[PDB]
Design a protein around this ligand. Structure first.
Ligand SMILES: [Mg+2]
Ligand SMILES: [Mg+2]
Ligand SMILES: [Mg+2]
Ligand SMILES: [Mg+2]
Ligand SMILES: [Mg+2]
Ligand SMILES: [Mg+2]
Ligand SMILES: [Mg+2]
Ligand SMILES: [Mg+2]
Ligand SMILES: [Mg+2]
Ligand SMILES: [Mg+2]
Ligand SMILES: [Mg+2]
Ligand SMILES: [Mg+2]
Ligand SMILES: [Mg+2]
Ligand SMILES: [Mg+2]
Ligand SMILES: [Mg+2]
Ligand SMILES: [Mg+2]
Ligand SMILES: [Mg+2]
Ligand SMILES: [Mg+2]
Ligand SMILES: [Mg+2]
Ligand SMILES: [Mg+2]
Ligand SMILES: [Mg+2]
Ligand SMILES: [Mg+2]
Ligand SMILES: [Mg+2]
Ligand SMILES: [Mg+2]
Ligand SMILES: [Mg+2]
Ligand SMILES: [Mg+2]
Ligand SMILES: [Zn+2]
Lengths: 99, 116, 135, 97
RNA sequence: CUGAUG
RNA sequence: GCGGUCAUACGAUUAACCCAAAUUAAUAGAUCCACGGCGUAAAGAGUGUUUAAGAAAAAAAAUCACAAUAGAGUUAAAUUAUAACUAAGCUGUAAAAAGCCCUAGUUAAAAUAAAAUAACCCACGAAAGUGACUCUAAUAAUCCUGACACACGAUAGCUAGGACCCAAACUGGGAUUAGAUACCCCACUAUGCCUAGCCCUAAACCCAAAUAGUUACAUAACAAAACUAUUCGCCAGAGUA
């Protein structure tokens, strides 16, 4: 039986290490008038803006490329015992499954 | 950036003299202050200057120069249209600034946690 | 009726004693299930006091020896060309193949860090991956 | 008995600390060209940390050197020497909008 | 600008 | 605390209650203040050192940019005593008046006082205190607490000598008010400035004592969360004070 300690070491998130400028692939799951909720797959979903190039080619279920900046935007302020989580992620659009 | 805060207030663990004497507890409130009657500037000043230049030069008659009379009215009409259309466009969108009526609702969604 | 107290203890500790005292003359259906399979921790109310002083949390950071090797690749070449796919469970990345080649060459008795580092990059050219050294 | 447990080691991805513009440099009180890049050209006010961006050591030595050069007769106080106006802009303040 | 008391 | 025609509280009646050959009233008694506190109620004494005295109960260390302090030298901005050109005005408040017209602006200019920005920095010193520049000396303890003893102790005040741009106690005028010996405006003095010698006071407040620690139990309220072991100095209603 494979326990948790062995299956965690072979996780792609462990192989990626820090989330600073990592190239990842994410599949869109919801569409807004101009915003795109792309789930790169780690914990949260990043909100990106529809570019002017091939903006119509972005539909529900499309896989796109991202450069992950931060995994979960959390920070502290004055008089806050905990942090203020944004419940999102930070990522930018580069391409849409160039293959 | 944000100024340093360690070693400023009067606490039991601080061995030196307190530097900052806060009037009220430095806790980030969940609602911003309302903007004190945000104002705007006038319009068509350059179009009015070149319009009154005709009056001062041709001894105050409109039959001499006319384009400086028509461009002034065009600027007035465009300003009158922008005063009404932008007064709704900027309140519907949030690209630039925003009134505190929305900042308060944005902060209440993710407020500060003084306790626990 | 019941016991609306929160800070005294758990719902089991507030219902079993009441039934023992004989006020609640009807036994709740979940009480037999609780007695059959109690949880690991009794649900007692505990107030989360803030931790002051030199005390620190008992959690320990997660770091492996493979991270010390991945740091070299991320400082030398940066992010790999093959983007990560977080949906594939058995997805192997470029840095993962590099650290695998490193730990494989380590068994050959190679103790020089340069010998263990540059030989993996030279061997990856046999598989045919493209590396972009950040200078 | 598990061999895939995390080991109590240091952080390998620990990034190097940010350096000031004069980190591991030698400041002086006679390089008027160097000291002028931190004063205002119109008034001569000494820019602070929020504008310059210097770490805790050089920030005070720059001020000391400026105050020494302003009394010894190396650099004027009421303004900046116009011969050193063509120096590259190091500060982070923009006047003309 | 100034305006005391119950 | 009760007594303004409804008194269960005054005086009398009825009734009831509690003691009992004792019942009340007065004064003495025994007991009762703190093995509790010292941020806001009474309380951490203005600071350091030291004698006496006390525990050293398990192991560790001493010392680094930046305005400690004491002497000596120096001045960048402004102002002024003083000269030269221009004008009859200058300063002055919400509005004026008074004052100055040896006035006002510019160009130059000693002596004295103070030390823009840097400072969103938080260091130095036991505390008060210190941030215009340079130089010399220098910032104790192989480091517990510890006085009424010793030594310091901001501004303000005193004595003698010196300095006096500027600000101003006081004072003299001009406004406002019914009155204004005040807030507003002008002039001016002691004083603030240096040396020597005193006085030893503050909301000397960070109202939180020092020495080594803890996040265990645990929100009077607010405020800076609750606490341990050895100590020093205080706290017994308020006014009187
Ligand atoms: Mg206050
Ligand atoms: Mg408030
Ligand atoms: Mg009667
Ligand atoms: Mg009676
Ligand atoms: Mg008592
Ligand atoms: Mg008191
Ligand atoms: Mg004290
Ligand atoms: Mg006293
Ligand atoms: Mg002296
Ligand atoms: Mg001078
Ligand atoms: Mg007059
Ligand atoms: Mg003189
Ligand atoms: Mg100065
Ligand atoms: Mg100190
Ligand atoms: Mg010492
Ligand atoms: Mg001692
Ligand atoms: Mg005098
Ligand atoms: Mg005067
Ligand atoms: Mg008078
Ligand atoms: Mg005096
Ligand atoms: Mg004194
Ligand atoms: Mg004081
Ligand atoms: Mg006191
Ligand atoms: Mg309450
Ligand atoms: Mg003591
Ligand atoms: Mg008394
Ligand atoms: Zn530096």
């Amino acid at each position: 039986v494979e326990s948790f300690a062995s299956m965690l070491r072979h996780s792609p998130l462990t192989q990626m290490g820090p989330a600073k400028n990592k190239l990842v692939i994410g599949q869109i799951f919801h569409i807004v008038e101009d915003d795109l909720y792309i789930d790169f797959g780690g914990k949260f979903h990043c909100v990106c803006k529809r570019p002017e190039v091939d903006g119509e080619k972005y539909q529900k279920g499309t896989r796109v490329r991202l450069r992950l900046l931060d995994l979960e935007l959390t920070s502290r302020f004055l008089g806050a015992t905990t942090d203020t989580t944004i419940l999102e992620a930070d990522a930018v659009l580069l391409g849409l499954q160039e293959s | 950036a944000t100024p340093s805060l360690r070693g400023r207030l009067a606490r039991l663990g601080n061995p030196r003299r307190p530097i900052l004497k806060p009037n009220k507890p430095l806790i980030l409130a969940n609602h911003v202050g309302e903007r004190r009657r945000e104002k705007g500037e006038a319009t068509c000043i350059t179009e009015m200057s070149v319009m009154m230049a005709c009056w001062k030069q041709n001894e105050f008659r409109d039959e001499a120069c006319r384009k400086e009379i028509q461009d002034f009215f065009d600027c007035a009409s465009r300003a009158e249209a922008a005063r009404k259309m932008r007064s709704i466009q900027e309140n519907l969108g949030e690209l630039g600034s925003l009134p505190p009526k929305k900042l308060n609702k944005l902060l209440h969604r993710f407020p500060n946690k003084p306790h626990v | 009726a019941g016991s609306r107290l929160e800070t005294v203890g758990s719902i089991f500790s507030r219902t079993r004693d009441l039934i023992r005292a004989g006020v609640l003359k009807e036994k709740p259906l979940w009480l037999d299930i609780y007695n059959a399979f109690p949880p690991l921790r009794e649900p007692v109310f505990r107030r989360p006091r803030l931790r002051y002083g030199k005390a620190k949390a008992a959690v320990q950071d997660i770091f492996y020896h493979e991270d010390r090797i991945r740091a070299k690749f991320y400082s030398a070449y940066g992010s790999g060309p093959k983007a990560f796919d977080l949906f594939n469970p058995n997805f192997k990345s470029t840095c993962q193949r590099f650290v695998e080649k490193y730990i494989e060459l380590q068994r050959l008795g190679e103790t020089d860090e340069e010998k263990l580092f540059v030989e993996a990059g030279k061997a990856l050219l046999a598989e045919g991956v493209t590396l972009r050294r950040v200078g | 008995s598990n061999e895939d447990l995390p080991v109590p080691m240091e952080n390998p991805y620990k990034e190097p600390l940010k350096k000031c513009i004069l980190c591991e440099k030698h400041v002086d009180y006679k390089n008027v060209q160097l000291l002028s890049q931190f004063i205002s050209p119109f008034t001569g006010c000494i820019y602070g940390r929020h504008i310059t961006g210097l770490c805790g050591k050089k920030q005070k030595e720059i001020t000391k050197a400026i105050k020494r050069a302003q009394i010894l007769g190396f650099m004027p106080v009421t303004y900046k020497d116009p011969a050193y106006l063509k120096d590259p802009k190091v500060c982070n303040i923009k006047y003309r909008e």
